[PDB]
């Protein structure tokens, strides 16, 4: 029953921050023999790593920028020049048996707006074909995350049929992309004819739109 | 060179029971540390379950205790993990460490094998293409598509053009309406040569041991 909640939960930094959290339990896990404590960190597709032990004792990875402090029942990890990779979701564990662990941070690095790259796709023909027509609509590489999108089909509004989905900020450049797919079926499809995708970023005033009709056909 | 894989099944029928082996290299188990299991399910959440001690002496979480087992086999230093009366809780990834015995010191945390217990059958997944249609892009850099719909469970793996260029690609986390995964995959790929070079999606659904590679055009 012995917790560590763990805060804050999220977190927003540039370049370079007093990047300083607390794991605080409900009892000593530092002085009481072997048990200390440790954070790991992982980047969004890989087990955790070591960093500290014993509660403040840097790894053989990188220290100096992170460094581990407090005792006995309140810790705090520190890392002063928040490197841009540094990107990750951080955890903090104790020893008394049966060893528990803290909520956990997750840390996004901030960064330039950037409009998104929007493209549209009409379904595949292989699809169509099946009775099933899905229309696809990518955001590619913008920031901030915060951004409302929505279909027209025919000039009216389209609510359910439609699932979104974000991809995690990137080490290369700190940016999200973001997927929506309208689906529906190969009749109710060609029942209309243009499809648009409007979407709302604070890039810009008015909507970025990116449609089309079945003039091919 | 202490290298420690988990490996079991991915997908198993709930109220059975899920058992799985983590092997590890480089080390012996009779002569150190403890050596654990941990599943962490989405985010947020990470849960010891209990360890094996070089000795042979074993510690469960309370909380899964009457429901876990911990066993090992010197010979071949190799240690196991066996929980019964599985539910859908019981889905998350799985994690095997050499968190130090007595406490805590220095732990080896394996790759990681997710196992997701559910109902539905193990259904593959059928993809398609995501072409453009001559526009302001078939003059600047065209952005193309691939679409996976409809496989059971995770995970899945796509590539392009069989690893050759992953330099501006965008895998989207997958998702579910129904008892069902779709995820989608964007490549930006340069104008200039879009048409002429051409360009091949790849996906492979190893639950159903299903490859796929799918070329691209207008």
């Known amino acids: 029953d012995i917790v560590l909640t763990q805060s804050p939960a999220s977190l927003a930094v540039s370049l370079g921050q007093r990047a300083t959290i607390s794991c605080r339990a409900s009892k000593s896990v530092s002085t009481s023999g072997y048990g200390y404590m440790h954070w790991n960190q992982q980047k969004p597709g890989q087990p955790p790593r070591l960093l500290i032990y014993?509660?403040?004792n840097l790894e053989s990875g990188v220290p100096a920028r992170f460094s581990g402090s407090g005792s006995g029942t309140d810790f705090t990890l520190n890392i002063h020049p928040v490197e841009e990779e540094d990107a990750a979701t951080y955890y903090c564990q104790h020893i008394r048996e049966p060893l528990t662990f803290g909520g956990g941070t997750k840390l996004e690095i901030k960064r330039a707006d950037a409009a998104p790259t929007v493209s549209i796709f009409p379904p595949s023909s292989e699809q169509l074909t099946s009775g099933g027509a899905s229309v696809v609509c990518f955001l590619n590489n913008f920031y901030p995350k915060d951004i409302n999108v929505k279909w027209k089909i025919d000039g009216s509004e389209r609510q359910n049929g439609v699932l979104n989905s974000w991809t995690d900020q990137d080490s290369k450049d700190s940016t999200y992309s973001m997927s929506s797919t309208l689906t529906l079926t190969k009749d109710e499809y060609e029942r209309h004819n243009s499809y648009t995708c409007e979407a709302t970023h604070k890039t810009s005033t008015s909507p970025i739109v990116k449609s089309f009709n079945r003039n091919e056909c | 060179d202490v290298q420690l894989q988990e490996s079991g099944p991915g997908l198993v029928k709930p109220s059975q029971s899920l058992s799985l082996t983590c092997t590890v290299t480089?080390?012996?188990?009779?002569?150190?540390?403890?050596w654990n299991w941990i599943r962490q399910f989405p985010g947020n959440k990470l849960e010891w379950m209990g360890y094996i001690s070089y000795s042979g002496s074993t510690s469960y979480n309370p909380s899964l205790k009457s429901r876990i087992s911990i066993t090992r086999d010197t010979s071949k230093n190799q240690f196991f993990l066996q929980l019964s009366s599985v539910t859908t809780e019981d889905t998350a990834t799985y994690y095997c460490?050499?968190?130090?015995?007595?406490?805590?010191?220095?732990?080896?945390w394996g790759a990681g094998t997710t196992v997701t217990v559910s109902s539905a059958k193990t259904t593959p997944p059928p993809v398609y293409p995501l072409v453009p249609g001559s526009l302001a892009q078939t003059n600047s850099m065209v952005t193309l598509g691939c679409l996976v719909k409809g496989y059971f469970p995770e995970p899945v793996t796509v590539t392009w053009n069989s690893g050759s260029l992953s330099s501006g690609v965008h895998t989207f986390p997958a998702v579910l309406q129904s008892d069902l995964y779709t995820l989608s995959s964007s490549v930006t790929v340069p104008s200039s040569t879009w048409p002429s070079e051409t360009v091949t999606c790849n996906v492979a659904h190893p639950a159903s041991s299903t490859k796929v590679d799918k070329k691209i055009e207008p």
């Open positions: 014993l509660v403040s």
């Open positions: 460490a050499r968190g130090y015995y007595g406490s805590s010191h220095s732990p080896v």
């Open positions: 480089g080390y012996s188990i009779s002569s150190d540390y403890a």
